[PDB]
């Protein structure tokens, strides 16, 4: 009934960044039993919102070749901070099977 669809999303940073926040990581789980990195908020007017594709609850899988599989929150954050203007996100979207 539930699955994941993997999508590639390219964002261009605005002056206020990509326009989203994250939670999760090994030792700082967003969801019980699950170490993945999740999008927790999408800022109105921000790059991610305007682009239209990223959604709250989506899993961040990779950023510019850097894996976010089984990373700490701090490793994730450093990856997100390390970015310049153009950012390629590999995203896992929760999906319902009909």
Domains of the chain with bracketed CATH: 1-98 (2.30.42.10)
The experimental method is X-ray
CA distance 15 to 35: 30
CA distance 95 to 74: 28
| Sign of the torsion angle spanned by Cα atoms 51, 55, 56, 61 | negative
**Using alpha carbons only, what angle is made at residue 92 by residues 45 and 15, rounded to the nearest 5 degrees?**
25
Q: Are 89 and 63 in contact (CB under 8 A)?
A: yes
User: What's the N-to-C CA distance of the chain in angstroms?
Assistant: 7
Helical H segments across 1-98, by residue range: 47-51, 73-81
CA distance 25 to 40: 13
Token digits of residue 43: 């800022």
| Resolution of the structure, angstroms | 1.9
């Amino acid at each position: 009934f539930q699955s994941m669809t993997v999508v590639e999303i390219k964002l261009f940073k605005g002056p206020k960044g990509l326009g989203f926040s994250i939670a999760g990581g090994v030792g700082n789980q967003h969801i019980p039993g699950d170490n993945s990195i999740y999008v927790t908020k999408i800022i109105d007017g921000g790059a991610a919102q305007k682009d239209g594709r990223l959604q709250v609850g989506d899993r961040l899988l990779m950023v510019n070749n850097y894996s976010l599989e089984e990373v700490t929150h701090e490793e994730a954050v450093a990856i997100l901070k390390n970015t310049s203007e153009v950012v390629y996100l590999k995203v896992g979207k929760p999906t319902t099977i009909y």
